[PDB]
């Protein structure tokens with residue numbers, strides 16, 4: 136097996152700048168070359184390291200021949216540097232943004248947000264990571280040797296055409312059910328191995344798929360200890376035997392590594408339309424962990440952090456976000472899926488403006504509301520009316536889930552989150568925006584099933 140690629144961990148130069156170049160190159164998948172896109176390389180991107188209470192400037196060079204944007208998913212930053220679809224970087228141009236980091240330690244990520252084309256640009260290869268640190272987390276003595284016992288694991292599917300190229304299409308089927316493929320990549324590699332020292336291994340898991348939900352576990356049933364969600368540490372580790380991860384979500388987990396017993400991180404079949412087609416009808420390897428008989432120094436602390444109490448609900452502004460899909464797209468897309476794949480597509484289970492929030496397909500020129508700054512709001516997001524999976528993401532914040540798709544959140548999902556599951560039911564989150572976003576650089580709130588976002592299931596909002 137190839138070794139797990141390790142994204143470079145980037146820090147500022149003396150001018151306090153980090154350089155990101157966006158460009159096209161070549162990757163190989165099963166001995167077949169394919170045009171891919173990457174940040175500082177051919178595919179995926181580096182890990183940008185940030186520190187709470189410090190500012191950094193990122194210089195972003197677009198060397199593609201088409202427009203793109205660079206969005207810092209999970210970052211509490213003003214709209215002007217949020218890199219939403221208004222954050223255009225012209226082909227051959229450069230944009231610089233200053234990130235004033237003011238949130239706890241967490242693993243966030245970054246990716247394009249080009250209007251109507253986010254799914255294609257992610258599918259072509261663009262994604263990177265953000266490692267935020269603070270004073271608190273370093274005192275815990277978690278595993279912390281990047282690329283050895285502290286490793287990012289960005290899991291993504293693709294499909295390829297006969298000629299080896301990435302086979303991306305935004306069409307009536309994928310506008311309904313998402314773009315998904317038959318090949319699983321782990322930091323861009325197919326089923327790599329990672330050599331890890333005896334003791335605890337920390338995995339920073341990212342579901343970077345356009346539309347596929349994942350569910351991590353280990354091949355020999357050793358548990359995973361969840362220590363962090365999208366927005367940072369949980370109050371204490373939560374032991375799980377499986378870990379569902381929606382598109383765009385991150386979790387950090389510790390897993391034990393013992394001498395002489397390799398094991399695989401796997402993903403288990405999920406109950407989402409289209410996603411259990413072989414080989415995803417069975418547990419599927421993500422990577423092999425190869426134990427090395429050197430003692431690892433990291434610890435699994437009994438306590439990690441303090442999560443604040445949930446504030447009173449009475450008197451808060453309620454915002455209702457009703458997701459919907461045009462009944463015609465939904466039917467025609469689901470029909471195409473069933474025709475292509477048959478009953479297995481439900482195992483366990485103009486279109487360009489057909490997906491909507493509050494009866495409107497995304498309108499860049501018109502933010503749907505002004506949210507308040509520095510005050511908690513209760514946002515109620517509903518997917519009643521269809522059966523698709525909508526991981527709903529809100530920019531500019533880390534929120535608390537009050538209700539996730541009609542039930543209190545699981546303990547490892549009860550901390551800081553920037554994504555909440557909406558599927559045929561209703562979720563409620565408690566959200567606060569600490570930063571401004573004017574109409575020219577508004578925040579987005581959208582489904583992170585990218586083909587839904589690109590065909591309308593997004594709104595802009597100001598703060």
Ligand SMILES: [Cu+2]
Nearest residue numbers: 207208209530
């Ligand atoms: Cu985001």
Ligand SMILES: [Cu+2]
Nearest residue numbers: 525582584587
């Ligand atoms: Cu959706």
